[PDB]
Design a protein around this ligand. Structure first.
Ligand SMILES: NC(=O)C1=CN([C@@H]2O[C@H](COP(=O)(O)OP(=O)(O)OC[C@H]3O[C@@H](n4cnc5c(N)ncnc54)[C@H](O)[C@@H]3O)[C@@H](O)[C@H]2O)C=CC1
Ligand SMILES: NC(=O)C1=CN([C@@H]2O[C@H](COP(=O)(O)OP(=O)(O)OC[C@H]3O[C@@H](n4cnc5c(N)ncnc54)[C@H](O)[C@@H]3O)[C@@H](O)[C@H]2O)C=CC1
Ligand SMILES: Cn1ccc2cc(-c3cnc4ccc(C(=O)N5CCCCC5)cc4n3)ccc2c1=O
Ligand SMILES: Cn1ccc2cc(-c3cnc4ccc(C(=O)N5CCCCC5)cc4n3)ccc2c1=O
Lengths: 255, 255
């Protein structure tokens, strides 16, 4: 069940994040959208208000790269609603010129948010348990030539997820950690490859990514949401890596 | 071959780095030791001077985390031996309490050093070619419960190496990138898993990894040097993952 549970989704004003938020609110959940984009977040919240209830959503503007901001955002989330049951970490960028910030946002922020969610969720620290869902890509399971740091960040995310799952199992925290790896999703992050200001030296080789995209296909963000509702609804699923593609669909990386 | 080539090996004051430096100097290559430990580097340099020629070693104190020092160390290394031919990125600290520093030292520093090596080594830019070998662990392709962020860093190293190999093949830089994934190697980093000021919250489960170490045995740093020499000697090896264990031995991750 999801009804009555509090969900905290990072970067949920557009793309996959807002699809996750819509799915969670459809199943019934008080949802906190945190995002560093003020206008995008306000527009997303005002759109979600029209079909859902006004009081089941809460927008917070914060940069997940900052640590004090993330801690204070978690403080506001748990203060407003009251608890925390689902934590989805999907705030990624495709900047290769400033790859340091890309690594700080994709990987460091994921681990920091996971630790904060364990702080506010683990039974040892006081809580009932829950789920923490980390969003990686198939780049975390296979190499991508035109974006090395993004591949490294996704690999780090998947490794950290499938190790922290075993850790949390050992610590009796009651928190189950799973990772979601989509293929290509029709979002804005897909048009970033076409620009050199966040691609840099690899802007000359952006055609290979387009060829791969055409060969495989493009996934609707709603379908990705069906993955999130599938891991949450299953209690006996800890550390499993969800893979979403076109031909196969929603399956798992049998390790 | 490395009969007269120049190698920048990282973290060569002690442990695996010292074995790499000894092997390379035995083969005939000038070696630039880099370390953040003044005394540990000075003693290693004195020993290597007493063994090999005085002029084939150059010790430079630098913290690989600091970007300015790292780019101001490559400058002196290339301003001393003239060229750069081998780049061994080997600098890992196990510290889960300050996991931000661990991530910065293990993953960010390796990527920055690889980018500097491509800047100073790519055939199209001003160079001739060479090899960049990033040191990883078997935890780079397996989950480890008692150290999640270390697993994430190693997964990032593996993914970045695998992707950057294809990238460098695509840009015609002539630089070959490979990664090494040893098992348990008898060094001074295994004593850090028995320290609560170094492992933090996972110090109650160090027995689980100690059981694994006793089970798979331990490895001699000379074997990792043999693996490095095997990687460098073969010109048809780009992106191959180097696995060293005690039963199979030196072999490759067949992806
Ligand atoms: N869209 C795709 O085709 C794929 C995306 N993913 C992953 O899904 C995640 C999100 O999906 P996208 O398609 O990229 O959506 P997107 O284009 O909407 O980008 C994610 C959103 O997160 C927010 N965000 C970014 N950096 C942030 C930060 N530092 N602090 C707070 N909020 C921040 C922004 O609102 C941004 O629009 C990313 O981590 C991405 O790597 C996974 C596989 C493929
Ligand atoms: N020893 C083992 O059993 C395993 C080790 N490794 C890898 O080997 C490396 C560790 O070397 P070991 O010989 O095992 O032990 P070690 O800890 O003695 O070697 C690492 C050395 O690197 C240097 N170093 C650390 N941080 C630095 C920094 N920021 N700047 C400059 N120098 C720095 C220090 O001199 C340090 O002693 C790591 O890269 C680790 O991932 C891989 C698999 C298992
Ligand atoms: C059957 N099959 C087999 C292989 C396969 C591989 C991929 C596949 C392969 N490289 C990828 C590299 C990067 C990303 C990614 O995160 N991006 C894109 C760029 C913008 C940022 C967001 C996704 C990828 N996705 C997708 C589908 C299939 C597939 O359906
Ligand atoms: C046949 N076989 C099969 C599996 C296997 C697994 C490992 C194996 C399994 N977890 C590992 C986890 C971490 C590290 C590591 O980097 N540390 C240790 C801690 C201090 C920092 C440095 C190495 C590991 N090494 C080793 C050998 C075999 C092996 O020989």
């Amino acid at each position: 069940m999801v009804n009555g549970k509090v969900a905290l989704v990072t970067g949920a004003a557009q793309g996959i994040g807002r699809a996750f938020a819509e799915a969670l609110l459809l199943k019934g959940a008080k949802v906190a959208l945190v995002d560093w984009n003020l206008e995008a977040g306000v527009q997303c919240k005002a759109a979600l208000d029209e079909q859902f209830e006004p009081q089941k959503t809460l927008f917070i503007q914060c940069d997940v790269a900052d640590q004090q901001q993330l801690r204070d955002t978690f403080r506001k989330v748990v203060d407003h609603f009251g608890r925390l049951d689902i934590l989805v970490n999907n705030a990624g960028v495709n900047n290769e010129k400033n790859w340091e910030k890309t690594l700080q946002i994709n990987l460091v922020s994921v681990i920091s948010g996971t630790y904060l969610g364990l702080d506010y969720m683990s039974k040892q620290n006081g809580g009932e348990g829950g789920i923490i869902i980390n969003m990686s890509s198939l780049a975390g399971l296979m190499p991508v030539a035109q974006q090395p740091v993004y591949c490294a960040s996704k690999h780090g995310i998947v490794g950290f997820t499938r190790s922290a799952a075993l850790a949390a199992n050992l610590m009796n925290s009651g928190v189950r950690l799973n990772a979601i790896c989509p293929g290509f999703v029709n979002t804005a992050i897909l048009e970033s490859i076409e620009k050199e200001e966040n691609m840099g030296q690899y802007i000359e080789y952006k055609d290979h990514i387009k060829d791969m995209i055409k060969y495989y296909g493009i996934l609707d963000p709603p379908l990705i949401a069906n993955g999130l509702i599938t891991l949450i609804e299953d209690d006996a699923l800890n550390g499993a890596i969800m893979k979403i593609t076109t031909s196969k669909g929603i399956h798992f990386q049998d390790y």
